[PDB]
Amino acid sequence: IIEPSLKALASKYNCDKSVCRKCYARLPPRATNCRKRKCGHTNQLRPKKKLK
Amino acid sequence: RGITIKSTAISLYSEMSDEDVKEIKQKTDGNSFLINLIDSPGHVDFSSEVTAALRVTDGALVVVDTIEGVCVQTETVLRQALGERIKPVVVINKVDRALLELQVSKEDLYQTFARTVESVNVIVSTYADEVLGDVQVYPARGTVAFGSGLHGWAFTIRQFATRYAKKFGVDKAKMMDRLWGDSFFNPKTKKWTNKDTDAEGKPLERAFNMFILDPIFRLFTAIMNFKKDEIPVLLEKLEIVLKGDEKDLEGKALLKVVM
Amino acid sequence: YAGFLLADPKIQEPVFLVEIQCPEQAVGGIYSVLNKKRGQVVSEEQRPGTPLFTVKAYLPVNESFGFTGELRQATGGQAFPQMVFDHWSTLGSDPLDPTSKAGEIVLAARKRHGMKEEVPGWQEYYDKL
Amino acid sequence: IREKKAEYFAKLREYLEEYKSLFVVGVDNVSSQQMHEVRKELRGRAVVLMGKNTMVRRAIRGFLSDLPDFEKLLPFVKGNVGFVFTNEPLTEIKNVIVSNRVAAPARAGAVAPEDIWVRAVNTGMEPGKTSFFQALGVPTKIARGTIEIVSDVKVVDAGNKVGQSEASLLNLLNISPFTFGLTVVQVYDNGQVFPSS
Amino acid sequence: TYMSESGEHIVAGTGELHLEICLQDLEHDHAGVPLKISPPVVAYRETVESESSQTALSKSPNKHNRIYLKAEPIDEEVSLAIENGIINPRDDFKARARIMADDYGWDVTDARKIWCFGPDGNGPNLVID
Amino acid sequence: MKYIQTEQQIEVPEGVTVSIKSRIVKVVGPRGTLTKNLKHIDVTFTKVNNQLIKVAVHNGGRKHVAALRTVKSLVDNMITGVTKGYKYKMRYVYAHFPINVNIVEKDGAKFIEVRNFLGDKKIRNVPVRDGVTIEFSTNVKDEIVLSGNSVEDVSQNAADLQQICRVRNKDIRKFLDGIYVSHKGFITEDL
Amino acid sequence: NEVKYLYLRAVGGEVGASAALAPKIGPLGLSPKKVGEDIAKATKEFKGIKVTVQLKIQNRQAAASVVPSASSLVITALKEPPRDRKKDKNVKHSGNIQLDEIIEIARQMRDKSFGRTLASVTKEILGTAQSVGCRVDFKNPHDIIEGINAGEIEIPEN
RNA sequence: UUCAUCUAGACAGCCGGACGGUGGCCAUGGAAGUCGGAAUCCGCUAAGGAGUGUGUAACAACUCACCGGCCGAAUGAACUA
Ligand SMILES: CO[C@H]1[C@@H](O)[C@H](O)[C@H](OC[C@@]23C[C@@H]4[C@H](C)CC[C@H]4[C@@]4(C=O)C[C@@H]2C[C@H](C(C)C)[C@@]34C(=O)O)O[C@@H]1C
Ligand SMILES: Nc1nc2c(ncn2[C@@H]2O[C@H](COP(=O)(O)OP(=O)(O)OP(=O)(O)O)[C@@H](O)[C@H]2O)c(=O)[nH]1
Ligand SMILES: [Mg+2]
Ligand SMILES: [Mg+2]
Ligand SMILES: [Mg+2]
Ligand SMILES: [Zn+2]
């Protein structure tokens, strides 16, 4: 098991993320456009699905 | 498969010493005991044969992993024992696993035991009817043993409380309950303090880690780090015997023989 | 047969009554499984002193295959179910439409029994007058 | 928009030229419930007006022409503060003003003014809550069906913010290092400001 | 272990792993014969949910006999009474109808004109004159 | 949109000297000396009063003036790095297997060795770039501290430790093992 | 012998069950069945409407005292000839109840309500009736509200 | 191109509050802002929706609209090619 603070720290990098709908790119949680050129920097983003 | 699917009876004969028969709060006569031991299955899919086992028995050996702690089945199997009014004794197993895998340095092992007993005692406290009251399991009183079944070694706080009387001449009745919990030997002062007190700097270690876990840690450290020049120094200090070929054994296999 | 086939024929399923001994934390998993299998939660209870709940519900026998394994999976092995037949519940859907929810289970029954696939209509067993 | 602001300017004008004194009471960490209680206590006795510091300064500055006396107020209108217009004995007003101390709950990630020590006394909560105690390392022995902490353990130090797990247990045990009150800043009275104390 | 209502031997167990071991013992040592396992066949009850909108008729093969009847949804509580022994086929008409009329709202004349219970002579289906 | 003149301000404290060639910036302070090559940016430095530098872009586009502000950030990072320093605090996150991280030497290269990550028998090695100081701080459990003058070097070496401990073939939402920067600040406290 | 507090929402006139007692009345052990009949005695006045039930349980002397509530009182002010919950789901709560009870109901509300003037508390309690859907003085409750704000239904400031 | 916020302090940033009637009505086995239908109210208000989401079996507990504290000059939105 992980301490709550260390689990929050690890989640800040592994879970607290956005995902592009078009190319599945992992983006910052406050991003408005995907950084990838393949999707044309589309604004279609979702939050990264939380476990369970 | 590697699992237990049934409940098979086995009979055991046990001789003891006179000194610990006196340390019995039960009307008894003699020096020998006969054990009728049942090996219940752990799976919930076989949780009916343990009910059959519990009805046919009066005591329960609650084996608990120090790694996984109190699991769902330990919750369940102990609940049915308490429903049958079975007095449980708890043994903490897989301490060897924690000492090679988790690398717990000095206090984490004590805290895992502390958390384990608290979680176990919670189970017996809420599922016990008011006919015994003192059915809580507690290591200083000698109702909890510690060891690794796979390696074939285990100990109790009572066992160490008597082991030091033969070498130090100190009291055992008030050290059996003293070697657990918040108790610090406080070297350089010769006073069993009851708190950290910061040790006026460098907060000191408790009696449990200092007196009980320290010797087994030292044997683990020496054997697993292959300090062949240091192994026999402890072994004679640890009053063991030698054989023609077990001395010619390396680390990870010494634990087999020495403990 | 003609009288039966005109009075909106329907089928009835057996439903189990299940009481489950689950702790405080995993009682939510029971409802998740029950909502998968059309189960109807009847009553909640607390055993005095212990956190173990006691949830009684009506689980249809048809949707009761593998129920405990998924129930164990959702509750982490903490749910302990006891299962026994309670009564019969009528299926609201028509068992005459082969594509209906009741029509598929009766269709399977017809096939495995060696009967015909389509059921003889009310025009049979009825003499026109 | 300037319209709605202008009644507040007008309402501020009305209040200031009716009552004789006011406070510069410092409103920090004060709940909506806390403010209503204080105001409810002061019914009739005094009224409390708090708003956007910028307008408050602005409103006064336009009033200064007709009402120079209030000029001294401006340098003390800083931070979240409210004006308690009163025409009643200052002594009793200040007591009622700083009266509503409330032990605020132990928030997660909240700065701890002092150390947080938990005691080995019994708590009465059933052994079910033992999960919270174990999480924070705190030893606990069950006695008379109640969670009894074995040994004194400090969960939160001084300064270091109270973590989520730490806070959780404190809320359960009703422990909190901070209690908030509508502390004051300055007392203007008839044309003179002076330290409230 | 028991015999189902659909003519199938139904071994029951605590869980999937427990059942797997029990079946393995059955196939290897207990019985000693190769056997196959499938999900049990769930039995259902056919019923009606209307009043036989138009009168059902059937004519005899010799064209001399005609029967006109209807179907009706016997109430749930009455169905339990037949199965639970409140309404006994062995009982006396115009005496068993005293219980059947006052406790179940039916009219005495139809209650008295009862010919049989179905199926098995004591089932929850009724025939009325 | 071709701003005629866009300007940014670089504040120079008393105890540091900034020597700027065409686009070679050399910042010398109490803690050390940093150098950065900026010949790819086409900007203009000019000192005003020996504690203030002005960097300007003339007739620059949106992208040109956007990187002008970046130059100010890069130079200020150099200046604050020789006065206050940089320290990045990283915590070890592990559910079951404790991560064994220490300092190992191979041909005098100051490698950070990683063992027992998720029980792996692989030995991960992270080189320490010159200028980065590695210390494990006691009274904080599972803490590695990286200190140095340049934020670029300190942050990237912290990132190398983080990237070498990425979980493969598992649900990263549950297998949260790794080494993550828990704090990013300066060597000197409360400066 | 300390005064613990508990709150419930048991329907008026009808008894309650251990299902919502044992989680709280279980540790202290006040014989849940005994508690339930106390609740009925409390609710006895308030037949047919859910009401809060104060429990000053000072070592098994449960209060069984109905805590007043705007909603229940407005329903209790309609006099609501006893609702048959079983017969039909989604029964209504309507009527024509006048100003006077709202003045009355407000009176035991002003104590805790922050509506310094009775006019404030009355439009509060009357505001609850707007949610209920009943009528006041044959007119929309919000029409009565705006009628009060225009000074024609002036409240006795007692 | 159009419409908005803005020194009576705009956007962003960080921090504080986010109430009371009230667990609004009805339903629900449980539904307390947050499974649902409908009602989209009042008071205190600088301000708070019969609620923005997370969340609980149901509570709770955070969170957001909403209003403030710090800084002080521009900013935001929707479209056009
Ligand atoms: C407590 O012990 C009981 C209960 O577990 C449960 O009632 C079940 O009973 C079997 C069934 C009994 C049902 C009623 C008699 C009417 C319909 C019967 C079933 C379906 O056809 C439902 C359960 C499950 C069995 C089918 C699906 C094979 C039943 C059967 O016997 O056929 O198993 C044993 C006998
Ligand atoms: N490392 C280590 N492993 C242990 C220890 N004790 C038990 N184990 C492991 O746990 C497994 C299960 O223990 P067993 O005694 O063999 O059987 P069991 O515990 O009864 O398991 P079931 O029969 O399924 O109930 C063994 O295969 C061991 O590998 C221990 O002390 N140390
Ligand atoms: Mg076994
Ligand atoms: Mg996989
Ligand atoms: Mg909900
Ligand atoms: Zn993309």
Q: What are the backbone angles phi and psi of residue B125, rounded to the nearest 5°? A: -70, -40
> Is beta strand B87-93 parallel, antiparallel or unpaired with respect to B59-65?
parallel
The answer to whether some atom of strand H lies closer than 7 Å to the beta carbon of G17 is: no
Say if residue F77 is in the same domain as residue F170.
no
Q: 3-state DSSP call for residue F27? A: strand
Q: Which residue of C has its CA nearest to E48?
A: C9
DSSP-H helix ranges across chain D:
2-16, 32-41, 53-64, 90-97, 130-135, 164-173
Nucleotide nearest to D31 (CA to C1'): H17
Provide the 10 A C-beta neighbour count for residue D85. 21
C-alpha to C-alpha distance for G73 and G101, rounded to whole angstroms: 9
C-alpha to C-alpha distance for D77 and C62, rounded to whole angstroms: 73
Q: What are the backbone angles phi and psi of residue D4, rounded to the nearest 5°? A: -50, -40
**C-beta of residue E54 within 8 angstroms of C-beta of residue E80:** no
Which atom of ligand 2 is found nearest the CA of B96?
A: 32
**C-beta of residue A43 within 8 angstroms of C-beta of residue A33:** yes
**C-beta of residue G36 within 8 angstroms of C-beta of residue G16:** yes
Residues in chain D: 197
CA dihedral G45, G48, G52, G54 (to 10 degrees): 40
Residues in chain F: 191
Q: What are the backbone angles phi and psi of residue G64, rounded to the nearest 5°? A: 50, 60
Q: Which residue of B has its CA nearest to E17?
A: B45
C-alpha to C-alpha distance for C56 and C61, rounded to whole angstroms: 15
For residue G39, give the nearest of G67, G59, G58 by alpha carbon.
G67
DSSP-H helix ranges across chain F:
62-83, 151-164
Topology of the domain comprising C10-129: Alpha-Beta Plaits (3.30.70)
C-alpha to C-alpha distance for D6 and D12, rounded to whole angstroms: 9
For residue A4, give the nearest of D165, D128, G118, B65 by alpha carbon.
D165
Distance B2 CA to ligand 2 centre (A): 9
Sequence-ordered list of residues with C-beta below 8 angstroms from that of A46, at least 6 positions apart, any chain: A18, A19, A21
Q: Is the peptide bond before E73 cis (omega within 30 degrees of 0)?
A: no
For residue A51, what is the DSSP state?
A: P
For residue B92, give the nearest of B125, B117, B118 by alpha carbon.
B117
Say if residue F36 is in the same domain as residue F77.
yes
For residue F38, give the nearest of F68, F1, F13, F62 by alpha carbon.
F68
C-alpha to C-alpha distance for B230 and B93, rounded to whole angstroms: 28
Say if residue F80 is in the same domain as residue F90.
no
The answer to whether some atom of strand H lies closer than 7 Å to the beta carbon of D105 is: yes
**What is the resolution of the experimental data for this entry, in Å?**
2.6
Q: Which one-letter amino acid corresponds to residue E80?
A: L
Q: Which one-letter amino acid corresponds to residue G26?
A: G
Domain finish residue from F85, F117, F146:
F85
For residue B198, what is the DSSP state?
A: G
Say if residue F166 is in the same domain as residue F103.
yes
Say if residue F119 is in the same domain as residue F172.
yes
Q: 3-state DSSP call for residue G158? A: coil
| Structural domains of chain F, count | 2
Based on its alpha-carbon atoms, the radius of gyration of chain C, rounded to whole angstroms, reads 20
C-alpha to C-alpha distance for B241 and G133, rounded to whole angstroms: 91
Read off the CATH number of the domain in which F168 is found.
Answer: 3.90.930.12
- The contact set of G with D (CB < 8 A) is 27, 114, 116
Mark residue G72 as left, alpha or beta (left: phi above 0; alpha: psi -120 to 50; beta: remaining).
alpha
Q: 3-state DSSP call for residue C11? A: strand
Name the packing angle between helices D2-16 and D53-64 (round to 10°): 60
Say if residue F73 is in the same domain as residue F151.
no
First to last CA, chain A: 17
C-alpha to C-alpha distance for E72 and F117, rounded to whole angstroms: 72
Domain finish residue from F85, F116, F134:
F85
What is the residue-wise DSSP string for F41-52? S--EEEESSSSE
Please identify which residue in the block is written with the tokens 């998993």.
C29
Q: How far is F25 from chain A (nearest CA, A)?
A: 31
Say if residue F163 is in the same domain as residue F81.
no
Closest ligand to C-alpha of residue A21 is 6
Q: How far is F97 from chain B (nearest CA, A)?
A: 6
Say if residue F77 is in the same domain as residue F107.
no
C-alpha to C-alpha distance for E74 and E69, rounded to whole angstroms: 15
Q: 3-state DSSP call for residue F19? A: strand
C-alpha to C-alpha distance for F146 and F74, rounded to whole angstroms: 20
Q: Which residue of B has its CA nearest to E16?
A: B45
C-alpha to C-alpha distance for B215 and F7, rounded to whole angstroms: 70
Closest ligand to C-alpha of residue B102 is 2
C-alpha to C-alpha distance for F165 and F172, rounded to whole angstroms: 12
Say if residue F57 is in the same domain as residue F112.
no
Q: Report residue B87 as tokens.
A: 């007095």
What is the residue-wise DSSP string for D113-124? SS-EEE-SSB--
Based on its alpha-carbon atoms, the radius of gyration of chain E, rounded to whole angstroms, reads 22
Distance of CA G138 to the CA centre of its chain: 23
C-alpha to C-alpha distance for D179 and D98, rounded to whole angstroms: 12
Domain finish residue from F85, F109, F126:
F85
Nearest protein residue to nucleotide H24 (CA to C1' distance) is G131
Say if residue F16 is in the same domain as residue F94.
no
Task: Give the DSSP H/E element, type plus range, for residue B51.
Answer: helix B49-56
Q: D148: burial class by Cβ within 10 Å (0-12, 13-18, 19+)?
A: middle
> Is beta strand G52-54 parallel, antiparallel or unpaired with respect to B59-65?
unpaired
Q: 3-state DSSP call for residue F31? A: coil
Please identify which residue in the block is written with the tokens 């995993």.
C26
C-alpha to C-alpha distance for B89 and B138, rounded to whole angstroms: 9
Please identify which residue in the block is written with the tokens 């493969």.
F168
HSE-CB for D143 with a 13 A CA cutoff: 9
Q: Residue D21 pairs with which residues in a beta bridge?
A: D86, D189
- Which residue of G25, G57, G116 to mutate against D (max D Cβ within 10 Å)? G116
Structure determination method = cryo-EM
DSSP-H helix ranges across chain E:
16-25, 76-84, 96-102, 108-112
Listed by start position, the domains of chain C span 10-129
CA distances F156 to B249, F31, F152, Å, are 47, 20, 6
**C-beta of residue G74 within 8 angstroms of C-beta of residue G128:** yes
C-alpha to C-alpha distance for B117 and D140, rounded to whole angstroms: 10
Interface membership of D146 toward B (CB under 8 Å): no
E strand intervals along chain B = 8-15, 32-39, 59-65, 87-93, 144-148, 153-156
**C-beta of residue A16 within 8 angstroms of C-beta of residue A9:** no
Q: Hey, CA dihedral for E78, E80, E84, E88, is it positive or negative?
A: positive
**C-beta of residue C19 within 8 angstroms of C-beta of residue C81:** yes
Q: Report residue F2 as tokens.
A: 């071709």
Interface membership of B75 toward C (CB under 8 Å): yes
Sequence-ordered list of residues with C-beta below 8 angstroms from that of D171, at least 6 positions apart, any chain: D105, D106
3-state helix, strand, coil in chain B (%, to 5): 40, 15, 45
C-alpha to C-alpha distance for B198 and B184, rounded to whole angstroms: 11
Say if residue F91 is in the same domain as residue F170.
yes
Domains of chain B: residue spans and CATH: 1-156 (3.40.50.300), 157-259 (3.90.1430.10)
Sequence-ordered list of residues with C-beta below 8 angstroms from that of D89, at least 6 positions apart, any chain: none
- Which residue of G28, G112, G114 to mutate against D (max D Cβ within 10 Å)? G114
C-alpha to C-alpha distance for B149 and G106, rounded to whole angstroms: 73
With an 8 Å CB cutoff and a minimum of 3 pairs, decide whether chains G and E touch.
no
C-alpha to C-alpha distance for F173 and F183, rounded to whole angstroms: 22
For residue A49, give the nearest of B71, B238, D110, F171 by alpha carbon.
F171
**C-beta of residue E56 within 8 angstroms of C-beta of residue E71:** yes
Say if residue F53 is in the same domain as residue F134.
no
Q: Residue B91 pairs with which residues in a beta bridge?
A: B63, B145
Q: Which domain holds residue F1?
A: 1-85
Q: Report residue F151 as tokens.
A: 């934020």
Sequence-ordered list of residues with C-beta below 8 angstroms from that of B233, at least 6 positions apart, any chain: none
**C-beta of residue D130 within 8 angstroms of C-beta of residue D150:** no
Q: Which one-letter amino acid corresponds to residue D61?
A: R
Q: Residue D179 pairs with which residues in a beta bridge?
A: D103
C-alpha to C-alpha distance for G35 and G60, rounded to whole angstroms: 9
